[model samples]
Target: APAFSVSPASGLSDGQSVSVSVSGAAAGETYYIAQCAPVGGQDACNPATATSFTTDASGAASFSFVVRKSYTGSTPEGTPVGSVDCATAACNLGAGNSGLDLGHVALTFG
Candidate 1:
């Protein structure tokens, strides 16, 4: 499986862009990424809603957007507002299909 994480987990400012990098992905395998926002009271691959981000052949992805000014704004400004922003990306550590084999880092803004 591809290990994923974000840099500067906190202290993100609005209108900043973040990078999600991947390593170990199957040399020729393909992967997809999505930039998602949390939907209050939901979990498990269910992100009230999500937007897709395009990844390069190197297994790296990115999203440039603004974050909420306050911790609590509304339904859209849910906890974990930012994520790995969901359940997605990197590596091919399994026996099935080509390994998307990789890891990722997300650089986010507040």
Candidate 2:
């Protein structure tokens, strides 16, 4: 099974830079990552902030991206404003097959 996680999991500000780490993935396979609404629920991954990385022979990868307050494209923003805003939804950075293999990590953003 694959795995992934992000640092500074909470108390984050919009546009703040963050680190990501993934491991135990299939050798040399590419993967996409994005936010999951508060973990797993009706609102799953928002393709807006979706990013990608390729795993190494050992099935490990690392990279970084900026957290934003505007990438909330999942439905029902909990306010009917537009979409679930990270500022309120506390979005989490989830990676790999959308939890197919139970490989995911999340962080709260405010």
Candidate 3:
């Protein structure tokens, strides 16, 4: 199992980024972290913002990525009509092995 968090999860605006940090994983293992839509699969996540990292011997990792407020069009994921509205949507930060689920941090805005 693992534990993680997304900081300043609330009071968010467009053109902002959140810091993601995690601990408790098998040594040297690779895992992906992502901010996912209120409801959907990996495709619902912003692929551009999704990324991976390898745990160090101490079983911890840290990184960050930018998040955007997308309209129905003009997405970082490049969907013309479908995009996540983190401003109001119940977006979440998650940790996994790209298929193996581990943890999640809900984004309940400020």
Candidate 4:
């Protein structure tokens, strides 16, 4: 499985920013980062709706963003926040080749 982690892993809040990192991707390859409603929530994703990054020669990519505030028009604060590493060439939103589910962590809200 690909490696995933968050800096200062707990005590997050709605719209609070965090560092998300993914490793073990192919060198010089492009991948996407997505935020899901929860660990097993079903949602579609696209480059226009997700963050994208290219891996370094060491097969790693890191970036930061504000955690999503809501899903389904409801506050996601205090709920589970999920993320994934997706191969750009193979990702297709909710259909075939959606990508890999890296992991998820519980979020804290203000």
Q: How many clashes in each structure? A: 19, 2, 0, 0
By lDDT rank, best first, the candidates go 3, 2, 4, 1
Which tens-of-lDDT digit does each residue in 1-110 have in candidate 4?
66767675444455567776777665655665554432244433322335556767897767785654343221123323234332211121111113554444444433
Q: What root-mean-square deviation over C-alphas does model 3 reach?
A: 4.0
lDDT of 2 by residue, 50-109 (tens): 667777788788788776665645543433223566666666566665433425555666
Worst 10 residues of 4 by lDDT: 88-97
Instruction: Give lDDT tens digits, candidate 1, residues 12-62.
Output: 553434444444343444554423333455422213223433345774544
Which regions of candidate 1 are displaced past 4 Å?
43-110
TM-scores for candidates 1 onward, in order: 0.36, 0.72, 0.71, 0.55
Model 2 regions lying over 4 Å from their true place? 38-41, 75-82, 98-102
- lDDT by residue (tens digit), candidate 3, 41-87: 43466565557788778977777766666533223345543666766
Off by over 4 Å in 3: 40-43, 71-81, 98-100, 108-110
Q: In candidate 4, which residue pairs get closer than 3 Å at backbone N, Cα or C atoms, i.e. clash? A: none
Q: State residue 98's C-alpha deviation in candidate 3, in Å.
A: 4.4
* Candidate 1 global lDDT: 0.35
The ten-residue window of minimal lDDT in model 1 covers 87-96
> Which one wins by lDDT: 3 or 4?
3
